[PDB]
């Protein structure tokens, strides 16, 4: 059940893929639309994604539905996942994705500089967000 429309959808067959497929698609499209080297596309991808997910999970507090009055009035989406059963398989995947993204987006631009510093920062903050100990703590 998970009895929460806003967080229970991350359990039906397929979610894991979709995700990868979207990122793959992103890469493709970005490099195609304007000439770029693969490393540039992957960094463009990484930062895009940084922005995208960091905002949502880690700053959207609440739920859109009026079913429950406010019972999750302040809890980022990431705090509601798996009903706070810290460090489950879904959480491990959501944590794992930034690591692979960082590794490849840095490698394919074989640590030059501007890009490298940016992504260092990126992965850092995203991984910081998670972390079992860090829970309901500003």
């Amino acid at each position: 059940p998970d009895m929460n429309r806003a967080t229970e959808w991350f359990m039906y067959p397929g979610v894991w893929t979709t995700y990868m497929l979207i990122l793959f698609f992103g890469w493709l499209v970005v490099l195609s639309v304007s000439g770029c080297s693969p490393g540039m596309a992957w960094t463009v991808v990484n930062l895009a994604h940084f922005v995208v997910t960091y905002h949502s999970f880690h700053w959207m507090k609440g739920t859109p539905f009026a079913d429950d009055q406010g019972i999750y009035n302040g809890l980022t989406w990431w705090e509601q996942m798996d009903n706070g059963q810290q460090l489950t398989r879904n959480r491990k995947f959501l944590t794992l994705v930034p690591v692979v993204l960082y590794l490849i987006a840095s490698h394919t631009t074989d640590y030059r500089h501007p890009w490298l510093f940016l992504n260092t920062l990126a992965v850092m903050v995203l991984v910081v967000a998670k972390f079992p100990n860090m829970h309901k703590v500003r």
Partner: peptide, 27 residues
């Protein structure tokens, strides 16, 4: 130095995977 970061992160994935689920505590 590519090797140090890659190795550290490899053992990082190992650490994160090998752990186990657990509930938060009560009061």
């Amino acid at each position: 130095g590519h090797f140090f970061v890659e190795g550290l992160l490899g053992v990082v994935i190992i650490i994160l995977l090998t752990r186990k689920s657990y509930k938060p505590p009560k009061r």
